[PDB]
């Protein structure tokens, strides 16, 4: 857990910044379950028009359909969005063509400014727990100081033909303010830190968007008039979390309903629908 304090926020946007002159192109790694929400507030003001690939990473986890809704508001902001699955190897040689898509101009103009043919440089940024480590170990074939005094000085790695890819990632604070992106970003464990709050928030979502697959997952019918608490109850008595007799065990519920959720257990969703979002778009634009 990256504990953030304003002092240490100052500090990775200042290093991050840092990093980013050193590169053609900036890969900022969302969460495919949450493209919008899983994004460093600050995110433009950081990257500063810098050619950039958007990975919706995890895509394993979500619904393509949502996704590709995301994907093309990346596009209409001049972006170059990818999908992938960074843990299981799927859909990688994509990111180089991207990177490669996403510098031609830049390089077209180096070209006719009689510069030489290069590697393209980059690197990766985001928010903690998006998969960061991952995709750069399995982009990189192994595993990215070792002496107790000693520390780690940042290198790139040969990734395909012509990437250079610098091996530490920019690590940036996920969304703070508003309380609904916090249930989604603690529903996705992009944050572990009111659980009952998030869990109600998982299952009216759930309800309102996958009925049928949350009934069939708990084996659990309930009545379409009831309040969120008989769900709870259903799911514990179904499940026999009992306490005291058979009063319902709501902790144990709740923990159980955000396992299956985190762990795409009931099925892949996307948590930002983008029809649902109109307003805080408007908002951010
Ligand atoms: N399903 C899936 N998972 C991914 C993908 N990319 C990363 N992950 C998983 O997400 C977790 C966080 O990945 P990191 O690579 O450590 O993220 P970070 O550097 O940005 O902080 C890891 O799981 P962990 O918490 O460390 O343990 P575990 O869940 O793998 O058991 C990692 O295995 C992906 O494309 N698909």
Same mark, same amino acid.
């Given at each position: 857990?990256?504990? +953030?304090?304003?002092?240490?926020?100052? #500090?990775?946007?200042?290093? &991050? =910044?840092?990093?980013? @002159?050193?590169?053609?192109?900036?890969?900022?790694?969302?969460?495919?379950?949450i493209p919008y929400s899983s994004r460093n507030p600050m995110i433009?003001?950081?990257?500063?028009?810098?050619?950039?690939v958007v990975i919706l990473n995890k895509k394993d986890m979500?619904?393509?359909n949502?996704?590709?809704? +995301?994907?093309?508001?990346?596009?209409? #902001?001049?972006?170059?969005? &990818? =999908?992938?699955?960074? @843990?299981?190897?799927?859909?990688?040689?994509?990111?180089?063509?991207?990177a490669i898509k996403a510098t031609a101009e830049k390089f077209e103009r180096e070209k006719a400014k009689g510069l030489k043919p290069r590697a393209?440089?980059?690197?990766?940024?985001?928010?903690?727990?998006?998969?960061?480590?991952?995709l750069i170990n399995k982009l990189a074939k192994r595993s990215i100081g070792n002496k107790p005094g000693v520390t780690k000085q940042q290198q790139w790695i040969k990734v395909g033909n012509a990437l250079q890819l610098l091996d530490t990632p920019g690590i940036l604070w996920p969304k703070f303010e508003d309380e609904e992106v916090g249930k989604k970003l603690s529903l996705t464990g992009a944050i572990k830190d009111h659980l009952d709050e998030v869990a109600?928030?998982?299952?009216?979502?759930?309800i309102q968007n996958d009925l049928?697959?949350?009934?069939?997952?708990?084996?659990?019918?309930?009545?379409?008039?009831?309040?969120?608490?008989?769900?709870?109850?259903?799911?514990?008595?179904?499940?026999?979390?009992?306490r005291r007799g058979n009063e319902i065990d709501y902790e144990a519920v709740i923990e159980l309903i955000i396992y299956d959720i985190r762990n795409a257990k009931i099925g892949n969703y996307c948590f930002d629908i983008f029809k649902?979002?109109?307003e805080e778009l408007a908002n951010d634009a």
């Open positions: 857990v990256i504990q +953030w304090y304003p002092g240490h926020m100052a #500090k990775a946007k200042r290093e &991050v =910044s840092e990093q980013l @002159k050193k590169v053609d192109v900036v890969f900022e790694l969302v969460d495919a379950r433009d003001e950081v990257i500063n028009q810098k050619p950039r979500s619904n393509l949502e996704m590709s809704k +995301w994907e093309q508001f990346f596009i209409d #902001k001049g972006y170059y969005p &990818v =999908s992938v699955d960074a @843990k299981h190897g799927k859909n990688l040689k994509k990111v180089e063509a991207a393209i440089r980059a690197m990766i940024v985001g928010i903690p727990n998006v998969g960061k480590s991952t109600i928030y998982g299952l009216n979502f759930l049928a697959r949350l009934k069939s997952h708990y084996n659990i019918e309930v009545p379409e008039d009831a309040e969120i608490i008989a769900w709870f109850d259903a799911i514990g008595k179904k499940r026999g979390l009992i649902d979002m109109t």
